[PDB]
Structure 1
């Protein structure tokens, strides 16, 4: 591969890592628009616009977990806002459901989720973290929200 490192199981990119290789130009620079990095079954991060993936170690930078995501583990190794992956992005986290305090089961029923207005809860959880809620899909518990940077 021409610079990019991604080996953690379950992770992928759109375009695929193989496609990113061929996109690399004569001077070895990988610039792509609308790039996505995801982990099958847990979520993904969509970066609208052009980004320079040249010599980025995505294994060390991007971390997608259940109901959680991290980009750049420490602030010291983080580039300024607008450069690298520290920029505007749309995050999707899957398997996001509340737990019934009586049965201790996950609440996946759309009607039940509308009863407790889980969507409004996720709007609040987004603002409190500096993000803007976008939508929620009960069938898969997909919580989509935009972030100004990481």
Structure 2
């Protein structure tokens, strides 16, 4: 297990993962979470098999987007490595003004233009399951069958 890259964390954190690490190197915690502070977070519910997995090359979180497993290189089977179901939360997601590219963060205009559905139809078309969109933090959460 490795987690360098600036901002990235975990729940349980990397310290709380040094304790629950099996007497062989078999780290398998349940209700695991990760993500870059301020950008997003991916919540893997239930049991997970983190048995020595390089998070540095597995998870990436840029604004409005997320990447799990660089491509499909070592992309473990559906339910193996990390290629399991989860609940992503990308934050700081807002529409932009057409005159000054400004971020519309106003819960009003946000609701007037219905950023909701627009963001939903993008989850639909992405094979994911829309969940919700919190205006205040520009949080957009959706569920995916795998990664």
TM-score over 0.5 for the pair: yes
Classify the TM-score, shorter chain.
Answer: over 0.9
C-alpha displacement of 1:43: 0.2
For residues 105 and 116 of structure 1, the distance between their equivalents in structure 2, rounded to whole angstroms, comes to: 15
For residues 89 and 96 of structure 1, the distance between their equivalents in structure 2, rounded to whole angstroms, comes to: 19
Given that residues 3 and 54 in structure 2 are in contact (C-alpha distance below 8 angstroms), is that contact kept between their aligned partners in structure 1? yes
Q: Post-superposition, which runs of at least 4 consecutive aligned residues in structure 1 deviate over 3 A?
A: none
The gaps in structure 1 that reach 5 residues or longer are none
The gaps in structure 2 that reach 5 residues or longer are none
Given that residues 133 and 140 in structure 2 are in contact (C-alpha distance below 8 angstroms), is that contact kept between their aligned partners in structure 1? yes
Deviations 1:93-134 (A, max 9, x none): 000000111232111000111100110111101011111110
Given that residues 33 and 43 in structure 2 are in contact (C-alpha distance below 8 angstroms), is that contact kept between their aligned partners in structure 1? yes
In proportion to residue count, which structure has more helix?
Answer: 1
Given that residues 25 and 52 in structure 2 are in contact (C-alpha distance below 8 angstroms), is that contact kept between their aligned partners in structure 1? no
TM-score (norm 2): 0.97
For residues 21 and 5 of structure 1, the distance between their equivalents in structure 2, rounded to whole angstroms, comes to: 11
Q: CA RMSD in A?
A: 0.8
For residues 116 and 83 of structure 2, the distance between their equivalents in structure 1, rounded to whole angstroms, comes to: 27
TM-score (norm 1): 0.95
Deviations 1:60-107 (A, max 9, x none): 110011111101012121101111111100000000000111232111
